[PDB]
Amino acid sequence: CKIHARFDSRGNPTVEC
């Protein structure tokens, strides 16, 4: 369960659900 950080930057880690 891997999703986006909740797009105007680059390199943000993904997060768990």
């Epitope: 930057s9 390199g11 880690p13």
Partner: antibody, heavy 120, light 111 residues
Framework: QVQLEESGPGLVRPSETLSLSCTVS?????????WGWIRQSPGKGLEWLGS???????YYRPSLESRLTIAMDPSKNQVSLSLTSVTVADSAMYYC?????????????WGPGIVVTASS | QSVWTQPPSVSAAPGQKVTISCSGD????????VSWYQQVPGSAPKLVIF???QRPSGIPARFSGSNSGTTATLDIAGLQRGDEADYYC???????????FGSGTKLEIKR
Amino acid sequence: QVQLEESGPGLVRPSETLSLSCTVSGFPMSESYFWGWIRQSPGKGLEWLGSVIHTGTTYYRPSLESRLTIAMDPSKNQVSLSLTSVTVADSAMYYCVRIRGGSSNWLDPWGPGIVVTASS
Amino acid sequence: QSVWTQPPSVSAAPGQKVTISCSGDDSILRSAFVSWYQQVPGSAPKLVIFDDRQRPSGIPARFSGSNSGTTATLDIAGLQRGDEADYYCAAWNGRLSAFVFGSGTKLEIKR
């Protein structure tokens, strides 16, 4: 759908500045997407150079950051590359790309590419 | 690493399946989304997988992806002669603060 086309010189002299431009048509540059540049040396792999978004935020390859400027002009519908103090190792195919940033960092679409040789 | 590790080549007959790996240091791919690119010689790269396992519209379901955190994989099933190409993985590297490509894998189709 997004349309990309690179333009610029095919031949640049050592120590001069390489200037490329990319025309972006059929898509708004003020949406939440980066615009960037990738290169590929003959017979070798893909190398990310950097990218820019309409807010002004920019990311560069650490080894090239002193020589590279990537910028955009959303009225003209263009993204630019400027690589100073070129060397023979800068010879490559250069591609413009649309990038979905954040945690995604996917590249779609790509321009057809422009061949650039740095030589005397 | 500044380039992800991929095998130089893979080879199989039409109708068969290949898997192509993409590795970094320890679990550096754990909190990054991996994408894959198909480059047919003479053309620009084309996105085939994004966000580890998703396919763009138009890409067939026989391309699939996974990311275990240590290693990401592209599977190509039901190989067709037009699948011959160089394949590259890519992902943000948070330790370097830079976008990184894999070293590339050439797919040869047998006949």
